[PDB]
Amino acid sequence: AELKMDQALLLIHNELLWTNLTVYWKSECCYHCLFQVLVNVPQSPKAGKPSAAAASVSTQHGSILQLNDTLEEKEVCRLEYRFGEFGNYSLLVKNIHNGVSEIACDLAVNEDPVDSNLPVSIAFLIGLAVIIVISFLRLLLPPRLRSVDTFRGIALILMVFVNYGGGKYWYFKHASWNGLTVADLVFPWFVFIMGSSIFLSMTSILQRGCSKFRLLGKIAWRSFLLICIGIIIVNPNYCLGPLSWDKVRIPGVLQRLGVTYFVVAVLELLFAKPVPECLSLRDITSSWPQWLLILVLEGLWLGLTFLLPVPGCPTGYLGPGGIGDFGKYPNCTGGAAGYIDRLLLGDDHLYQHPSSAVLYHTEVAYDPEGILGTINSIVMAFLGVQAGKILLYYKARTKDILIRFTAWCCILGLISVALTKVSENEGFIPVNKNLWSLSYVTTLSSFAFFILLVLYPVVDVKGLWTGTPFFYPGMNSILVYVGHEVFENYFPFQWKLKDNQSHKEHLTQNIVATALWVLIAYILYRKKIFWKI
Amino acid sequence: AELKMDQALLLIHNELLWTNLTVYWKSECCYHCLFQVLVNVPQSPKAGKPSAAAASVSTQHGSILQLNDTLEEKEVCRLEYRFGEFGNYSLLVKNIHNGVSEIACDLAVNEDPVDSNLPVSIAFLIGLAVIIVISFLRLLLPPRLRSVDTFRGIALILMVFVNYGGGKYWYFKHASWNGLTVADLVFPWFVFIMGSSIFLSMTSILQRGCSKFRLLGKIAWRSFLLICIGIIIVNPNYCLGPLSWDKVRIPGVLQRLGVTYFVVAVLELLFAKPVPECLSLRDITSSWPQWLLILVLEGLWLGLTFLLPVPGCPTGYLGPGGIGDFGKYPNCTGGAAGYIDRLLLGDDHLYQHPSSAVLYHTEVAYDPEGILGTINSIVMAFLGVQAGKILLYYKARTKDILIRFTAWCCILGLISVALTKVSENEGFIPVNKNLWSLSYVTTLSSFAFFILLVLYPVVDVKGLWTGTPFFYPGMNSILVYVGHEVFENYFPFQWKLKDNQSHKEHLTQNIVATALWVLIAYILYRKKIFWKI
Numbered sequence A, B: 001a002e003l004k005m006d007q008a009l010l011l012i013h014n015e016l017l018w019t020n021l022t023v024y025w026k027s028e029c030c031y032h033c034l035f036q037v038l039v040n041v042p043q044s045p046k047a048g049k050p051s052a053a054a055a056s057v058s059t060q061h062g063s064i065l066q067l068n069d070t071l072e073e074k075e076v077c078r079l080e081y082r083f084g085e086f087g088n089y090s091l092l093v094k095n096i097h098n099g100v101s102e103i104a105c106d107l108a109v110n111e112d113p114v115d116s117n118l119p120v121s122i123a124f125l126i127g128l129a130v131i132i133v134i135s136f137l138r139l140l141l142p143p144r145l146r147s148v149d150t151f152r153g154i155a156l157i158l159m160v161f162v163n164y165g166g167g168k169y170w171y172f173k174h175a176s177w178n179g180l181t182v183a184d185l186v187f188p189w190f191v192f193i194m195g196s197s198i199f200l201s202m203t204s205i206l207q208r209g210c211s212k213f214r215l216l217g218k219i220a221w222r223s224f225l226l227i228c229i230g231i232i233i234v235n236p237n238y239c240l241g242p243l244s245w246d247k248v249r250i251p252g253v254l255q256r257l258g259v260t261y262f263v264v265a266v267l268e269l270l271f272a273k274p275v276p277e278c279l280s281l282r283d284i285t286s287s288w289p290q291w292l293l294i295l296v297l298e299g300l301w302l303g304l305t306f307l308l309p310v311p312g313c314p315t316g317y318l319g320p321g322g323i324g325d326f327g328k329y330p331n332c333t334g335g336a337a338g339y340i341d342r343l344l345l346g347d348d349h350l351y352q353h354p355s356s357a358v359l360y361h362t363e364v365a366y367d368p369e370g371i372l373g374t375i376n377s378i379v380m381a382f383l384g385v386q387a388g389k390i391l392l393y394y395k396a397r398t399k400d401i402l403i404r405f406t407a408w409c410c411i412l413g414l415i416s417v418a419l420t421k422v423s424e425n426e427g428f429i430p431v432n433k434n435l436w437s438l439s440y441v442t443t444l445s446s447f448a449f450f451i452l453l454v455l456y457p458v459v460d461v462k463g464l465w466t467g468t469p470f471f472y473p474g475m476n477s478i479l480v481y482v483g484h485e486v487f488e489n490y491f492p493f494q495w496k497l498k499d500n501q502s503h504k505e506h507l508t509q510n511i512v513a514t515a516l517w518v519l520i521a522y523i524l525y526r527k528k529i530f531w532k533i
């Protein structure tokens, strides 16, 4: 068996004679949430014959159990415990007779749980062993930037692993409302890299002599293709049935990239300047028209998020709704960000399975790729432009590039510390992928500037590493992204599992499927088949 | 509603006082089948109060109705009538008192049916008008053979139209067991064209100076790719779930093509001869080992079909089983071919939805691309090879090519006439796509030779027609096939219909999808993107 993944068996024995017990369950990860009923345990009919009730408790995080007298609505005892996967626990509720009439509840482990993260530890050990063997085996025996392809390839490899299931591990899934996991990293990085490629390609194109009007037509064609491919190809689940307009999801990943690419590229094209040939600020001062408009857009996001009144909803609400925030705003998932989507697009055209629907039991439709959060996608893509400006403005001096990448990583990291208050749920603006919050952008941009700080001198300047095998997917990013959406259910990326409730079998299937997309992109590289939108 | 597509309402009124009626239904298309119970009409409780029972009768073909006294198992009256779609008919069973005690049953049309084939006529008229308008507007204002590309493109367009539904018309679907429809034409034509291309490409390759071992390796690689793509990509329905070995279909279209290509290409390579430069027979005499082996294979097919004993089944059985042949051999669908498929591969690895399951109500699994029909696939491919030999041997003289095509078409047509006895279900070997019978192959080869005879002087010699718009799909056949398999459910090839029981909406959807695939192939042609296995 009755146990599923990340579940343990809990047996409650009620030795009390005149007390009915209701067991409530709360997860320690669920912030300011309500207790949910777990199981009702009746009173013991006779002394020495305890009443037994069974329940399944989630073991992904810590569990908080509250046992309340049903008749008197009074708390009997409170229990905090972290259960283990496929464990068998017994909770005995008996009244101690050592001079008092109090009730003491204790928990016993009938059968020990299993190590849930053992496959992940073994997979990391196996992967590290392969790298060492390959490294030791060989010891005995305008140009395209390789570090940008390597950094894009890393995000593509992480994308396929987590989109295909991630081993069904909670830290390889999206966070419910607040915080960061491994799955919440790749999308901002793709926006960061896309902005860098905007400046790198535009500078070379305009240098050779292409006109701005002809380049404006190329920007609009690429944006149109990205939006159309997302709505028609990527978004729908055609296994359910033929497409109907009433159930078409308008927002999405490629629609966000298409709108973000258009705004940033047009902004860069409109105020484009030639790149001139230590203490200089010429990559920032020369682009002050963009910066002034970017901070005006950022003020609009802050103004609508914290000041726009949402009917039947608090102003500036940043919680998930549902049973969160003590269940006072069940239909307020997203605050003003979700209100704008429901008002402009309607619930039928939004994303129907938000990540908060499991931990906070939200009922309304929220789209993480909403309208309001597109402002912060432009901010993230404009920080990629700054990364591409440092590379080209100071190409001659490697030390100049490294100094600028360190200053931006440190400054953007300091803003995140003040905004998040180094906390998951506290702070002025908590990190939130669903809202695409400001501290989400500054945190992931700080990571992106640090990755370039390490990848650029290792891969591009010194050449100690060629980026293998990451740069092969990085040169066919659209083929890999569109490919794994179309062929998600196909063999050999997916096959029937002997045990659907096993972390080991899910992880092995997802690792093999990810390694096949790296191999597919390697064959395309060897055959010189590259597709660009 | 109650009426579905291709259905009529039948109301039976029973005026008899002491007679219970059971109405049996048999389709005129179903050959030597059993009557099936349609509806039970109770006796009339009182005079002047007839008992009414309603039933839905199929309107695709003519209907045979038999009304039998339930108690005495005796026939009251028999009725033959072709009902119309969405019609409302009343069948009154009353006993005539004009000097006798007989029972007379008459049928009345309460509401007239609709014209089912009106959308097809309108579509044909629209297409003819568009063709005439385009022609008048244009009037006012080794190289590849273009006729082979045009023929392949015609086959591909028909394939895409009929696989997407064909308007849900019965003549755009596969025949149940015996006979021919439009859907049963394209696969033998593809095999024929594949053989012709085999000879053309092999002659061109061997002329330039390539070795036979490299060509053998290329042949093996192409066959392996075709078989693998058929088994892993095209056959499974991944909308149902992840691939499990127990429910994997091994036979299929691309597997048949791969095996046939391997056998025919290896046979041609083994006995390859240079092409030398009216009454000559040098294209047939020079390939006598191939002809001898082909006749040996045909003899093997005939012997296994008409002489191999099947347990619990007659020898030489060619019927569909089920309720066919008076329901005497329900589990004998396919005879020796189905027996060989079930013995060598097992029922779980065959086609679970044979075309005979609807008309003859068969319950066993039969695969149309079985093991025994590969012999006749090879025969069809060798006839295509002979067509290519005629094309290349007498390239200088158009009259010789025309004479040879006419002679081959006439001989194959005479063989088909002798085998089928110009009948659907009679004759020594009736035409059957499921069995891939000899008469099927000879008929389709005669049709292909006639098509080549028409196309070659019009398209290749005189140049009156360029093959538009057929050669655009004809030059990307594998891309079109695999794409329409992969993107069958996607927009704009499919969308939710207002009325799922309408021929007009299904036909419009299928025509639009076919036109879109032709446009995709044209776009690929303009961008010079050609994929060959």
Ligand SMILES: *[C@@H]1O[C@H](CO)[C@@H](O[C@@H]2O[C@H](CO)[C@@H](O)[C@H](O)[C@H]2NC(C)=O)[C@H](O)[C@H]1NC(C)=O
Pocket (backbone or CB within 6 Å): A024, A035, A066, A068, A073, A074, A075
């Ligand atoms: C279990 O019983 C306790 C009583 O100790 C409940 O706590 C009270 O909850 C009410 C709201 O229903 C508050 O107004 C009180 O202030 C709470 N008292 C204390 C001491 O915290 C608790 O809510 C009960 N559990 C559930 C799930 O209802």
Ligand SMILES: *[C@@H]1O[C@H](CO)[C@@H](O[C@@H]2O[C@H](CO)[C@@H](O)[C@H](O)[C@H]2NC(C)=O)[C@H](O)[C@H]1NC(C)=O
Pocket (backbone or CB within 6 Å): A009, A088, A089, A090, A110, A111
């Ligand atoms: C969880 O552990 C309990 C022990 O506390 C198991 O209950 C025992 O089951 C065996 C098998 O029939 C009996 O012989 C014992 O008498 C039971 N003990 C008690 C105290 O009830 C229980 O079966 C375990 N659950 C699972 C799913 O294995």
Ligand SMILES: *[C@@H]1O[C@H](CO)[C@@H](O[C@@H]2O[C@H](CO)[C@@H](O)[C@H](O)[C@H]2NC(C)=O)[C@H](O)[C@H]1NC(C)=O
Pocket (backbone or CB within 6 Å): B024, B035, B066, B068, B073, B074, B075
């Ligand atoms: C309806 O009744 C007729 C009787 O006239 C049945 O015809 C007979 O069928 C049996 C088989 O059950 C044969 O042995 C007889 O030779 C048939 N007689 C004639 C005159 O044909 C007929 O089968 C009945 N209909 C159904 C569906 O059973």
Ligand SMILES: *[C@@H]1O[C@H](CO)[C@@H](O[C@@H]2O[C@H](CO)[C@@H](O)[C@H](O)[C@H]2NC(C)=O)[C@H](O)[C@H]1NC(C)=O
Pocket (backbone or CB within 6 Å): B009, B088, B089, B090, B110, B111
């Ligand atoms: C098929 O036609 C019959 C007529 O023969 C329809 O029956 C009539 O229905 C109307 C509507 O209630 C009644 O007023 C008449 O008295 C009925 N006539 C008889 C003879 O019963 C029947 O409704 C039609 N079926 C459909 C599906 O439209």
Ligand SMILES: CC(C)CCC[C@@H](C)[C@H]1CC[C@H]2[C@@H]3CC=C4C[C@@H](O)CC[C@]4(C)[C@H]3CC[C@]12C
Pocket (backbone or CB within 6 Å): A296, A297, A299, A300, A302, A303, A304, A307, A308, A309
């Ligand atoms: C000029 C743009 C692009 C950037 C700055 C946007 C600022 C000025 C906008 C964005 C959202 C706006 C708020 C939205 C809604 C309300 C509630 C209303 O009862 C009073 C005004 C108030 C509080 C607005 C004040 C101005 C505001 C904060």
Ligand SMILES: CC(C)CCC[C@@H](C)[C@H]1CC[C@H]2[C@@H]3CC=C4C[C@@H](O)CC[C@]4(C)[C@H]3CC[C@]12C
Pocket (backbone or CB within 6 Å): A454, A455, A458, A463, A464, A465
């Ligand atoms: C053959 C000679 C030049 C030795 C080559 C050693 C190469 C393969 C090794 C030496 C040090 C390594 C780097 C050390 C640390 C990092 C940072 C990490 O976040 C990504 C990998 C990266 C960037 C490694 C890439 C591979 C690397 C460059």
Ligand SMILES: CC(C)CCC[C@@H](C)[C@H]1CC[C@H]2[C@@H]3CC=C4C[C@@H](O)CC[C@]4(C)[C@H]3CC[C@]12C
Pocket (backbone or CB within 6 Å): B296, B297, B299, B300, B302, B303, B304, B307, B308, B309
């Ligand atoms: C030599 C091959 C390749 C071509 C000719 C094949 C002929 C000779 C084969 C094919 C199938 C064979 C038949 C298959 C099964 C039986 C039933 C058995 O109880 C007697 C022999 C008999 C009737 C065989 C006779 C020979 C046969 C007709």
Ligand SMILES: CC(C)CCC[C@@H](C)[C@H]1CC[C@H]2[C@@H]3CC=C4C[C@@H](O)CC[C@]4(C)[C@H]3CC[C@]12C
Pocket (backbone or CB within 6 Å): B454, B455, B458, B463, B464, B465
């Ligand atoms: C511009 C001058 C040369 C006139 C061109 C006329 C062309 C477009 C016309 C004239 C006769 C036509 C052909 C007449 C009959 C057939 C047989 C049919 O099964 C396929 C089309 C085909 C092969 C036609 C193709 C188009 C055709 C060749």
Ligand SMILES: CC(=O)N[C@H]1[C@H](Oc2ccc3c(c2)O[C@@H](O)C[C@H]3C)O[C@H](CO)[C@@H](O)[C@@H]1O
Pocket (backbone or CB within 6 Å): A159, A162, A163, A164, A183, A184, A186, A187, A253, A351, A368, A369, A484, A485, A488
């Ligand atoms: C890391 C990441 O890819 N995250 C994005 C993820 O996209 C998916 C979701 C599901 C699936 C995706 C891609 O690919 C298919 O092969 C498999 C299928 C299971 O989930 C939502 C989409 O609504 C985005 O907001 C989010 O940024």
Ligand SMILES: CC(=O)N[C@H]1[C@H](Oc2ccc3c(c2)O[C@@H](O)C[C@H]3C)O[C@H](CO)[C@@H](O)[C@@H]1O
Pocket (backbone or CB within 6 Å): B159, B162, B163, B164, B183, B184, B186, B187, B253, B351, B368, B369, B484, B485, B488
């Ligand atoms: C004219 C022809 O295409 N006929 C072959 C047809 O293949 C299909 C069948 C169904 C579908 C096919 C292709 O394509 C998808 O887009 C749509 C889906 C509905 O039916 C069986 C397959 O087992 C073959 O025996 C037969 O030769």
Ligand SMILES: *[C@@H]1O[C@H](CO)[C@@H](O)[C@H](O)[C@H]1NC(C)=O
Pocket (backbone or CB within 6 Å): A018, A019, A020, A042, A043, A071
């Ligand atoms: C406990 O619940 C049962 C079920 O209704 C009830 O009969 C019993 O009276 C309850 N006990 C107390 C002490 O309320």
Ligand SMILES: *[C@@H]1O[C@H](CO)[C@@H](O)[C@H](O)[C@H]1NC(C)=O
Pocket (backbone or CB within 6 Å): B018, B019, B020, B042, B043, B071
């Ligand atoms: C007709 O069938 C009904 C239903 O069982 C039965 O009661 C009646 O007796 C039958 N009539 C005759 C004549 O057999």
Ligand SMILES: CCCCCCCCCCCCCC
Pocket (backbone or CB within 6 Å): A179, A180, A409, A413, A414, A416, A417, A420, A422, A423, A424, A431, A443, A446, A447, A450
């Ligand atoms: C789940 C908690 C998130 C906390 C945010 C992380 C704070 C660190 C800011 C980035 C520091 C610089 C890293 C290179």
Ligand SMILES: CCCCCCCCCCCCCC
Pocket (backbone or CB within 6 Å): A211, A213, A214, A216, A217, A220
């Ligand atoms: C010298 C080449 C000139 C070509 C002009 C092309 C104009 C592009 C128009 C795009 C407008 C898109 C608006 C959303």
Ligand SMILES: CCCCCCCCCCCCCC
Pocket (backbone or CB within 6 Å): A217, A218, A220, A221, A223, A224, A258, A259, A262
């Ligand atoms: C020369 C080709 C021009 C193509 C123009 C396509 C128009 C679509 C514009 C999409 C804009 C979306 C971002 C707001």
Ligand SMILES: CCCCCCCCCCCCCC
Pocket (backbone or CB within 6 Å): A340, A371, A372, A374, A375
């Ligand atoms: C009461 C009506 C509120 C209307 C709010 C309008 C929101 C539109 C701004 C979204 C910006 C997106 C930039 C890409």
